[PDB]
Design a protein around this nucleic acid. Structure first.
Length: 91
RNA sequence: ACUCUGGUUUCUCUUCAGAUCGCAUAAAUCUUUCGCCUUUUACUAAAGAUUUCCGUGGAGAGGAACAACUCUGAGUCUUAACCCAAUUUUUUGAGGCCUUGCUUUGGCAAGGCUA
RNA sequence: AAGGUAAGUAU
């Protein structure tokens, strides 16, 4: 019993709609939306620590996002080989 | 050269963490010393004691993937051509006889005789 | 970031 990954277009659509809270269609359930918003600093911390390095053009990262698009987390720790990382930054 | 030994990867969970949990390094709270002082919320910078957070290790448990592929260790780790013996055993000249002591007798003990 | 709200009655 493991959660299968969703297509990247699913979260794209979820973010694209429900953008403004003024819509009254999804206002019925907001405790699930509001309760997951306190972890915004966690999303900030995970996002900035996975910032791409100057030698990298595009960095695809695993993403853990709320079912309503309330918050998105970068579920990845930037592990780097120390000699490789130091040599890359020296270059 | 024989036989048995039986993994690695990955995702969770539960606990234990001495150790540079971390060859890196944040914040909060409290109690003392200050610095600003005029009241909160911020602070100044040292010490002491906590808590949280970003991470970490070991062990245990439960799933998945490559489950079929081999390891290591142990087990006795198992074979013939031609060439060899003065220090321990298949080439090794080490034989016998007698004396006297002594043992209930057998024998034993020492010496002598060699070839 | 505050210690910088007049208290109102009408529409």
């Amino acid at each position: 019993a493991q959660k299968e990954d969703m297509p990247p277009e699913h979260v794209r659509k979820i973010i694209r709609d429900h953008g403004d809270m003024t819509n009254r269609k999804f206002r019925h359930d907001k405790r699930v939306y509001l309760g997951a918003l306190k972890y915004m600093p966690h999303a900030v911390l995970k996002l900035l620590e996975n910032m791409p390095m100057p030698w990298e053009q595009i960095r695809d990262v695993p993403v853990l996002y709320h079912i309503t698009g309330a918050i998105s987390f970068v579920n990845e720790i930037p592990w780097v080989i120390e000699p490789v990382y130091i040599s890359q930054w020296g270059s």
